[PDB]
Each structure stands twice: as C-alpha cells, then as structure tokens.
Design a protein around this ligand. Sequence first.
Ligand SMILES: CCCCCCCCCCCCCCCCCC(=O)OC[C@H](COP(=O)([O-])OCC[N+](C)(C)C)OC(=O)CCCCCCCCCCCCCCCCC
Ligand SMILES: CCCCCCCCCCCCCCCCCC(=O)OC[C@H](COP(=O)(O)OCCN)OC(=O)CCCCCCCCCCCCCCCCC
Ligand SMILES: CCCCCCCCCCCCCCCCCC(=O)OC[C@H](COP(=O)(O)OCCN)OC(=O)CCCCCCCCCCCCCCCCC
Ligand SMILES: CCCCCCCCCCCCCCCCCC(=O)OC[C@H](COP(=O)(O)OCCN)OC(=O)CCCCCCCCCCCCCCCCC
Ligand SMILES: CCCCCCCCCCCCCCCCCC(=O)OC[C@H](COP(=O)(O)OCCN)OC(=O)CCCCCCCCCCCCCCCCC
Ligand code: SF4
Lengths: 156, 70, 98, 175, 80, 318, 69, 105, 115
Amino acid sequence: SRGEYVVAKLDDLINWARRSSLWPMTFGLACCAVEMMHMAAPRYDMDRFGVVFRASPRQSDVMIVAGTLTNKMAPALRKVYDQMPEPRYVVSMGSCANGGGYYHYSYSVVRGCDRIVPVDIYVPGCPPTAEALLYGILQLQKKIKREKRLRIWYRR
Amino acid sequence: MWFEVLPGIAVMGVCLFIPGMATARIHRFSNGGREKRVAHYSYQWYLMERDRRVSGVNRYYVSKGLENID
Amino acid sequence: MSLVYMNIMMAFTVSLTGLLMYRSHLMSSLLCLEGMMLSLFILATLMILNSHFTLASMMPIILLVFAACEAALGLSLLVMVSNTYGTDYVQNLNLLQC
Amino acid sequence: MMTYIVFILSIIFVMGFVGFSSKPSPIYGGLGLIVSGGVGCGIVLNFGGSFLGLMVFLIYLGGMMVVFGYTTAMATEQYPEVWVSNKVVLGTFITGLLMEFLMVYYVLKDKEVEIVFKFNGMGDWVIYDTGDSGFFSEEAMGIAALYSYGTWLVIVTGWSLLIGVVVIMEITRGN
Amino acid sequence: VAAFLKNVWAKEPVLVASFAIAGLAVILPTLSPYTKYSLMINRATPYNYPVPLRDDGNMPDVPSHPQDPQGPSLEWLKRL
Amino acid sequence: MFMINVLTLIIPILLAVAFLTLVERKVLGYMQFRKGPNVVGPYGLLQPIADAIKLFIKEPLRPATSSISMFILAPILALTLALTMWIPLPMPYPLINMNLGVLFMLAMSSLAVYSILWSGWASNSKYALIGALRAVAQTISYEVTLAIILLSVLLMNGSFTLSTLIITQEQVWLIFPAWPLAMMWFISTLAETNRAPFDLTEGESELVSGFNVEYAAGPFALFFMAEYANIIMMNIFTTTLFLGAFHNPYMPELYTINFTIKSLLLSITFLWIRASYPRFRYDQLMHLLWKNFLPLTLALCMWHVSLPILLSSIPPQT
Amino acid sequence: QAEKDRRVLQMLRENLEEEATIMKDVPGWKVGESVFHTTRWVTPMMGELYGLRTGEEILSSTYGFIWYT
Amino acid sequence: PFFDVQKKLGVDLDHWMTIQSAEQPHRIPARCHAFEKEWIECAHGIGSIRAEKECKIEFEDFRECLLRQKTMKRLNAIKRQRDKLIKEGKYTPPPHHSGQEDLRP
Amino acid sequence: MNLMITLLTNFTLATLLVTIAFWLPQLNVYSEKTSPYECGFDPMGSARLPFSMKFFLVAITFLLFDLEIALLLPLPWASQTTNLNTMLTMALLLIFLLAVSLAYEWTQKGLEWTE
Ligand SMILES: CCCCCCCCCCCCCCCCCC(=O)OC[C@H](COP(=O)([O-])OCC[N+](C)(C)C)OC(=O)CCCCCCCCCCCCCCCCC
Ligand SMILES: CCCCCCCCCCCCCCCCCC(=O)OC[C@H](COP(=O)(O)OCCN)OC(=O)CCCCCCCCCCCCCCCCC
Ligand SMILES: CCCCCCCCCCCCCCCCCC(=O)OC[C@H](COP(=O)(O)OCCN)OC(=O)CCCCCCCCCCCCCCCCC
Ligand SMILES: CCCCCCCCCCCCCCCCCC(=O)OC[C@H](COP(=O)(O)OCCN)OC(=O)CCCCCCCCCCCCCCCCC
Ligand SMILES: CCCCCCCCCCCCCCCCCC(=O)OC[C@H](COP(=O)(O)OCCN)OC(=O)CCCCCCCCCCCCCCCCC
Ligand code: SF4
C-alpha cells in the first residue's frame, strides 16, 4: 500500500533527524566524566556527529551516566531524568554505572543505574575509553535508526 | 581544512543575496521598469498624486511626456 | 469636538479613577500616574498637530521630561519605605495618625 | 471600516488603560501600559507626528522596564493576581470594558454624544488639512526650534534634571 | 601641574582624552574663521517661496528679473 | 504582491539563521583545533535541517508553576520583533522606507528585551529570575551609550533616514572620521544581543541556561533564531552605518554583493570574538559603559556637534 | 499653486451643486450657508471636500502620505 | 502677585510660544492664523470686561476654526440625509462622486 | 497600509510555529517532568520572593538619562536653523550639564553597588 510506504519514509526521516542531532546533557560524576571530556577533545570530536552538550535537561536528548551513582545522589538523577522531554535515552558507561564496579558491596552505592532509570546502551570499562564511548554513541544512533514508531502506529 | 567553512558560508551568502535584490526586482516590476519613487516630504507626495491624476490610468508610473500637449 | 479627543479624555478619566482608589500597593499608583501623564501627552500632541502650532512642538517632549522629575522621584520615595518595612503596602504608612 | 483606524486604535488605547488601571499586579500593569503606549504612538503617528510617537514609545519602554525590575525586586507577592485571581480587580475590569463599549455603541448609533463636553461620531479624517507642507515636516522643525528659540526652556529643564539627580542622591542615603 | 597631568594620564587616560576633546570642542569654534560661512550657507538655503514686492516706483536694490545683476548672489558658495 | 516581497524577505533570513548555526559550529570548532559537523551530509550541509526537524518533534513541556499566557507570548513576541525590525534596512532599497528608521530600530531593540524579561518572570524558577534581572542590568548598562553613539554618528549624515546613509558614504567610508564611535558601537552591539563576552543571560557557567532553562524544544528554538537573526541584523546595521558601499542605481547587485560580504566578515568577527574571551561579570559590564564609554561618548558628541559648524560642512536634511 | 486652486474650487462647486439636490425637502435648510460670520476666504477642511465621495479616495487623500511605505 | 520681570528688563523668555501668530520657524502659519490675529487685534487694550461682549464675533469665529463643531454638525446632517435618501432609493449618486470623475490635472 | 500587513505577517508566522510545535508530536505529561528545575533537588522557597536589587540608584539615573539624552536627539535638525551660535551654545550647555550630573554621581560613590 502507498500509505505504508509513506509512513515508512516519514519514520526514516524522523529517525534520521533524531539520530543525527543527539544533544546529551553535561552530567558527570567521576573518572568516566574525565574520559567523556576526552571524547569531547579535538581528537575524537563528538560535534562532528551532531553530538553537542546542553546544560539544561529540558533541551537535551540523551543522558550519559558517567560515574558512581551513590545513595545520596539517586533521587537527583531520577528527577533529572524525569525532567527530560520525550524521546529520552540513557547511556550507562563505566563499571560503576553498570553494576557497581569496584564498590558493588559498599553500603552507600547503588548497584548499577538500571535500578533507578531505564538504560538503552551499556558501555563496559573502567574507564571505557573515548573510542569505546564514541562506539557506544554510534551504536545508540544505530538503535535509533531501526525504530518503528509510525509503522507500528499504522499497524495498530 | 579551514576552507571547508567556505561552502556553508557561501550558502549564507546566497541566504543574504536573495531578499534584498528581490525587492529591487519587485521595485523594477510594479513601477514599470523604474525605481520605486520615494516620498519623504509632502511636496514629493503631491507630485506623486499629480502624476497619478495626470496619467489617466490611475498608475503614477505611467509617464506622459511632451507629446501630450498641443 | 472630534472622536479621538473623547477617547483620550475617557482614558484620562479611567486612569484618574484608577489612581484615586488605592489597592494597597504603591507601584500600582505610580503606574496610574505614568498612565495619566501619557494620556495628557497624547492629548496635547494631538491638539498641537491638528492645529499646526509648530512652535509648541517643544512643549510635549519637554513636558515628558518632567514626567521623570516626579516618576523616578516616586521610586526614590519607595526604597526608604521598603527599607522601613519589608513590603510596600500603603496600610503600613499610618504612623502619622496621632 | 478602514476610515475609523484612529478611532479603533483609540479604543484599544482606552482598553489598555482599563487593563492596567484596575491594578491587578504591576507586571501585567506594565504590560498593559506597554500596549497602551504602542497604540498611542500609533495614533500620534497617524496624525503625522512620527518622531514624537517613536520618542514616547522608547521613553515609556525604558521606564516600564526599570519599573518591572523594581517590582521584581521590591513590590512582589507569593501569588500575584493576573486579572481574575481577585474578585474586585476582575469586577472593575469588566465594568470598565462594559462602560467603554457602551460609549462606543452609543456614539456609533446617532454619531453624537454628550459626556461633559460634546463629541461627534464621524471619523477624525475630516479635520485634516488639505494642503502640502513643502520640503519639511512641521513637527520636526518645531522640535528643532528648541535650541534656536527656547533658551529659557532648555536652561530650566537642564537645571531641573541636574537638581533631580542631586535629589535622588540625597534621598536614598540613610544618614 | 605637569606632575598632576602625568599622574592622571598614567591612572585614567580615558578621562584625560575626554577632557581634551571637550576642551577643543569648546574653545575651537570661537577661533576658526569659517563659522560665518555656515551662517550664510544656512541662510542661503531657499525653504520658502521668494514672494515678490509691488513696484511702487523707487526700489533700486531689488531686481525685476532673477538674471539681473542686482541681488544676493552665491558665487562665494560655488567657490568656497 | 507585497506578500511576495515580505515572504521573500522573511524566509531567506530563517535559512540564513540555520546556516549561521552551521557556520558558527564549524568555525568555532576550527578555531579550537578540531572539526565541526561533517557526517550528516556532504561537509555537514544537512545539520541545521536535522536540528530543526528534531526540535519540532519533541515535547513542549509547559510547566505547572508558570503563567502559561506569558510563557507562550514571550517567544512569539521575540520572534515577531526579530522579524518586523529587519524591514527598514536598505538592501539597497528597503522594504519599508521609513523616514525615521534609526529611531524605529532603537525602539524595537528596546522592545525585544521584554521577551527575555517575561520569559524569565513567567517560568517560575530562580535561575530564570536571575537571567531576567541580568538582562535588565545589561539594558541599563548599554542603552544610553548606544543612543548617544548613534546620535553623534548621525550628525554627519543629516537625518535619521537609513536610505540616505549610502549617499553620505558615497565619497569615503564613515569609519575614517568616526572610528572611536565605531569601536564603541561595535562593543555596544556585542553587549546588546547578549553575545560573548557579554552573554550574561544564557550563562552556562554561572547558571544552567538562564531565562530559557524552563523552555523545552519548540519554544526554545524561537529564542535561538531570534538571537541569530538579531546578530545578523546588528552586523548589517553596522555595515550600513560605518562601511557604506558603492551603489549603482542601474546595478543594485553590486551593492548587494558588497554589503553581503561585509556583513559576513562582521559575523565572522563576532564569532572570532566569541571564541577568544572570558565572560564579563555583569557588575563589571555595568561599570564599563557607565564610566569608560559614557564620558568619551559625551565628549565625542560635543566634538561632532561643534565640528560641522566649525568647517561649513553641515549636511543637508533633504 | 494655480492647479491646486482650480482643483479645490471645482471640488467645492461640485459639492455645492449636489447639496441642493440632496437637501430640498428638509425644512429650514439654506443651501451653501457658511458657518463663519466673516466673508473672508478660509482654507477648506478635508470633510468639506471629500464628504460625498467613496472611501478609496478618502484613504488616498487624508492617509495616503503617512501610509506610503 | 505677578511681578512682570520680563517687560521691566526687556528680556523675552516665553512670549514667542504664547500664541500661534508669533514668529514661527520658516514662516509656517497656523491653520487659524487669520482668526486669531483678528481676535487679538480686536481685543487689544480694551480690557477683558469690554472684550467679552464687544469682540465676541471674532472670538466665536476663532473657536469655530479651532474645533469645527458647526462644520461637523452640517456634514453629519448632510451625510445622514444622503444615507436616508439612499435607503429609500430616491437618490442616485452622481458619476463624479462615485470614482469615475477625471480630475483637473 | 504596508506596515500593518508586515506586522500581521510576521505575527502570524511566529504564532504558527508554536501550534505546530504543540499539536504535532506525541506528548506524555506526568507530575514529575514539569516540576521547576533546580539541579535535581526540589527548591527551597518560591521564585516569587523579593529579589533584593543593588543597582537601584543607577536605575533611577538611567530613568533620568534616557529622556535627558532624548532631548539631544533633534540636534541634527537643529543644525539647519539660521541662528547657529545660540543653538551651539545651548547644545554645549545641555551636554555640559549632563557631564556635571554624571561627575557628581561618580564622585559621591553613587555608581557603586550597595552591600
Ligand atoms: C566597527 C569597526 C571595528 C571595531 C572593532 C572590532 C574588532 C576588535 C574587537 C576587540 C575585542 C573586544 C572585546 C570586548 C572588550 C570589552 C572591554 C572594552 O572594550 O573595554 C573598553 C576599555 C575600558 O577600559 P577598562 O575596562 O580597562 O577600564 C579601566 C579602568 N581604570 C582606569 C579605572 C583602571 O577602553 C575604553 O573604554 C576605550 C574606548 C575606545 C577609546 C578610543 C580612543 C580614541 C582616541 C581618542 C584621542 C586620544 C588622544 C588624546 C587626545 C588628543 C586630542 C587631540
Ligand atoms: C510518495 C512519496 C513521498 C512520501 C513522503 C516522504 C517524503 C520524503 C521524506 C523525507 C526523506 C525520507 C528519507 C530519509 C532518509 C532515509 C535513508 C537514510 O536513512 O539514509 C541514511 C543516510 C546516512 O547514513 P548513515 O547511517 O548516517 O551513514 C553513516 C555515515 N558513515 O542519510 C543521508 O545520506 C542523508 C539523508 C537526507 C534526507 C533528506 C534531507 C532531509 C529532509 C529534507 C526535507 C524535509 C525538511 C525541509 C526543511 C525543514 C526546515 C529546516
Ligand atoms: C539558499 C540555499 C539553501 C540550500 C539548502 C540545502 C543545502 C544542501 C543541498 C543538498 C546537498 C546534498 C545533500 C545530499 C543528501 C544525501 C543524499 C543521499 O545520498 O541520500 C541517500 C539516501 C538513502 O538512499 P539509498 O536507497 O540508501 O541509496 C542506495 C545507494 N546505492 O536517500 C535519501 O536520503 C532519500 C533522498 C534524499 C535527497 C535529499 C537531497 C537534498 C535535499 C536538501 C533539502 C533542501 C533542498 C533545496 C531547497 C531550496 C531550493 C529548492
Ligand atoms: C499583547 C501583546 C502585543 C501583541 C501584539 C503585538 C504586535 C506587534 C508589536 C511590535 C510592533 C509595534 C509597532 C508600534 C508602532 C510602530 C510605528 C512604526 O514603525 O512607524 C514607522 C513609520 C514611521 O515613519 P514616518 O516618518 O511616519 O514615515 C511617513 C512618511 N513616509 O511608520 C510609517 O511609515 C507609517 C506606516 C503606517 C502606520 C499606521 C499606524 C500605526 C499602526 C500601529 C499598529 C499597532 C501597534 C501595536 C503595538 C503594541 C505593542 C505592545
Ligand atoms: C573645561 C573642559 C570641559 C569640561 C566639561 C566637559 C567634560 C566632558 C567629559 C565628561 C566626564 C564626566 C565624568 C567626569 C568624572 C570626574 C570625577 C571623577 O570621577 O574623578 C575620579 C577620578 C579618579 O578615579 P577614582 O577616584 O579611582 O574613581 C573611582 C572609580 N574609578 O579622578 C580623575 O581621574 C581626575 C579627574 C579630574 C582631572 C582631569 C584632568 C584632565 C586634563 C585633560 C587635559 C587638559 C584639559 C584642559 C581643560 C580643562 C580641564 C579641567
Ligand atoms: S567505572 Fe572506573 S573509571 Fe569509571 S567512575 Fe567507576 S572507578 Fe572511575
């Protein structure tokens, strides 16, 4: 049908616009934020791919959990994720933001950021290098590209 | 290198070339191939109204020359 | 007279009855003062431009200058009030009743 | 109904005056005074005084901006009233608009009204002059004659402004 | 007064420049010989119509034609 | 027919704003030893399209504690004032040939501050209030010096008409006899639009985002295009004021090309200034214009009002 | 000046001749009665000339210069 | 008290903006210059008590020139009668009053 | 005629870009996203509290100065008058009084910020 082709092309267009204009949030906690700034360094140059940091959650696309999410910090992270407009993606990077890392058995460490916020991409390492984080960003772009929003809306 | 800032800037040049000249082209289309006459002072407006009345077509840019008189 | 004269005079009377009944706030009265000044300016320049009195065109703008000669002054009569009390209510200005 | 353009602008002028003279909150009073100044400069610009309208627009925009800074600083409330948060403010705004539109309807019916003076109902376009003004606008030459003729006015105005500056310094001192 | 001038030029040169510009702008038009040139240039600009006078019979200073040699000419303005 | 003229005025300036975002990102990257966007298309030509489509399919996020009417009116007023104030600029023939275009642009530049002020006040947040009051401080810092600079530089033109400014600069540029006024005007235009080093309202260091911290996508783009159209209009205004090009009435394209490349160089100079300077404090900017610029502006105003009388060079008013 | 003088005299005469045709059955009316006690010529007012014409000429005459761009 | 300093010292301060018949810039005349000139020349030196009843014709004509009340009343009556005749269908507008008029120049 | 057409066109083009931005996408509103943003934690107090200003004196000075320099704006046209010495003297006197007022504000520590 022609309507299926139309909604498929529109879905491709909006996925291209959303995946080529990722706006992360300036939000770091620990070592992995230093590696994120080294991904923002002139060598790797995230702004080539349309990735540009934005300070406010209201004008941001994704959130990169870079560091250790402790017990005193989790409500703040949850509120910051809640304030972001849809569609919203979370990239968990580093061992601390994945499963607690070095501090899995600590009393005041949340064992992974999955317990607080939904996570799209898990980036392993301590720290995962700027090349690895750029690879995770490109993997997130590939995941956004194969979204099927308008096709499912036409099917539903 | 640096010269790759020159394509997009060039597009900006086109984006700053289109409007203004278009107004001139518009000013060369409505006013019959001449500039749009300016009326900063009331004497110029009175001359504009006299020309519009004397053209006979209710268009001030229709210029009647010395062949009109006897 | 004309019609716009009636409307500007009605605006002046509206701002006058806005000024004369206070609503426990000094800034609102200052805004009413500025509105009456604006209405007087508009009426004066309307009459002057209608009657072709060119040499009186110095009148309104100069008039407008003296607007600040009270209006900004009113603000300088507020900050001490707002240093005397935490707010700028006109019911706090009742110490001179005895 | 384009011949009554100045009348319509004056209707919006009194509408804005009713809007800010009901005193809801000085933010929205400032917005109403900005709207009133805009339509007033439109009126006087329609009468030919473009310089005077632009000048009063600029002056009142600057004054209202300083006022807004003051009310944000000093004259504020936990719950400001927009127009309907207070019964008295909404009520007096409604009766102001009702009186204005009643006067409009009465003057648009028999083209004559008696409020204390006597007013017509025709548009103001009748009272214009039919001749030209040469190579100058009268209002520009009139205000430019402030320096060639009005030496006394310039002297007293400059002295008043300097004394005003000194007065502002002296009042807000504290000791 | 040289020490005061040097100190105020080392501390705040902007005020020194402003006061020098102000002093030149105040004392200079009274020294230049070209102010009267501005005076008759402003007076020689014809805003209004030169309304003629009735010929009573004894007016030797005003001409009958604009091309007559009598009258206020502006060859000085063309020369300058 | 006038509809065609106004749409061909307002659509290319939106395209110019989008490609100004592109040029800003790429030039600012290249001045920082790195590359700008080049992966979206051929040399990154499709990045503004991706940004614009992305921002208009996101959620608007109107807050609950914010007065919704002013929250909607403020970006509309910002974009509107950014649109209907490009008109009196002669390019080389203005769309609206106002007799008092300079005062019109002054008044509508004073009016555009209220959009920032009501955006800060409407969204119930402390950072927005701080941004709005910093905008107020910036306005009272710059406005009087800007107006006196314009008055002193218009004493050689003859009148407030922007169309006659080309005729004034037909012989020589106006930057040669008024270069201190030109420098002070450039700093005033930098501080007017809240551009670096006088940002002070969208401060990402002292604040998070300032007055537009509660404005999500859709309304947030309006402030961005308003700001960028404002910087282009300041560049064109400065070019017309101080760098008047040769105008041929038979070939307006010569003047169009000339002031286009001059305004492009002025915008490049704006971004050149942006990448190289630390942010001013907003009390130091207040003491910058009121103590250093203002006395020199007064002295230069007296000099420029006593100069043409001194030299029999009073310009005509017709 | 001569053209303007003849034009306004023509317009005033045209408005005067059609005033008698419009107002002939009204009681107490006098056609062409002045409002000034003197017989000196006064400058005609815009309502006296364009009082019986269509609105396009009104907008061209009393608002044409100010609204012109 | 009115200490008339200005005529005592011969110094002109605000006598030029007092009336519209004074020395205007570039000899720009007011719209009612003749009426005000006649009223001032009529009521010069005779006192206000005599001038209120001896030069009332010139002052009434000047007030009519200032506000045009009677001209508005006459124009309103003419327009009302014309609209009433149009509504009754007894009157047709002339061709020169409808747009196709061919003015003088 | 043309100015209100341009104003209406620009107002319509501005006001159409929000109703497109509102009614187009998929919205999901809950009572945690639209809270005021205070860097992850809920704020203390309201944003309608008195925000004690410091530059009130310079604000009043700007209130006077805006119109006191707006008196100086007809100085181009004032260069076209026949009487030129009087105009030059009055303009120089006006700007001199402006400079005297500014210097009096500067010397009395009026430009400095409170607290
Ligand atoms: C439009 C054309 C191009 C313009 C230039 C654009 C490109 C260059 C841009 C450079 C970067 C600007 C970034 C922002 C900078 C902000 C700070 C700033 O501007 O501060 C201003 C600073 C302020 O100084 P400050 O901030 O250091 O303050 C010093 C304060 N005290 C002294 C107390 C310590 O300077 C000025 O205000 C100077 C303004 C221009 C002066 C021009 C003088 C001309 C010559 C006059 C005569 C001199 C001779 C003597 C008299 C002779 C008489 C015959
Ligand atoms: C009945 C028929 C019509 C039916 C309705 C549909 C009409 C058309 C809708 C828009 C176009 C739909 C197709 C969109 C692209 C689909 C293909 C795609 O995704 O291509 C990917 C390619 C980049 O590939 P990438 O994965 O990034 O490669 C890695 C790089 N090493 O991407 C590219 O190379 C670039 C893709 C560019 C897409 C077109 C340009 C953007 C849209 C412009 C028009 C709309 C917006 C106009 C302006 C709005 C205001 C700014
Ligand atoms: C004032 C001047 C303003 C100028 C503004 C625009 C500047 C840039 C102009 C265009 C520059 C080139 C852009 C190229 C985009 C990428 C095209 C492309 O390769 O698309 C491929 C994509 C997927 O196709 P696929 O099926 O994978 O191909 C099989 C290959 N073996 O297929 C698709 O994505 C589908 C086809 C998309 C085609 C898009 C073409 C460019 C559209 C740009 C929008 C504006 C156009 C101009 C508007 C103004 C003039 C009218
Ligand atoms: C609730 C919030 C507000 C929502 C609505 C917002 C609307 C847009 C607000 C921004 C624009 C405000 C404009 C204010 C008036 C500006 C006047 C102006 O631009 O004048 C320019 C020009 C003067 O030139 P001049 O010397 O007269 O030339 C004649 C000889 N050719 O003039 C001319 O050449 C004359 C052209 C025709 C003029 C007609 C009369 C004036 C029309 C005014 C329209 C209404 C303005 C309302 C402003 C509200 C502000 C809050
Ligand atoms: C008659 C000439 C024209 C006069 C009228 C026109 C003036 C145009 C310029 C207007 C200037 C307005 C502002 C003036 C402020 C002066 C007072 C002042 O603020 O002095 C302070 C300053 C020392 O700085 P400080 O005390 O630290 O300041 C606090 C923060 N900086 O103190 C100083 O730096 C000293 C300031 C006074 C001495 C200046 C000397 C300048 C000499 C220039 C060359 C010769 C000029 C000859 C003309 C006569 C000059 C008196
Ligand atoms: S994962 Fe390792 S590098 Fe990253 S924050 Fe934890 S300890 Fe630091």
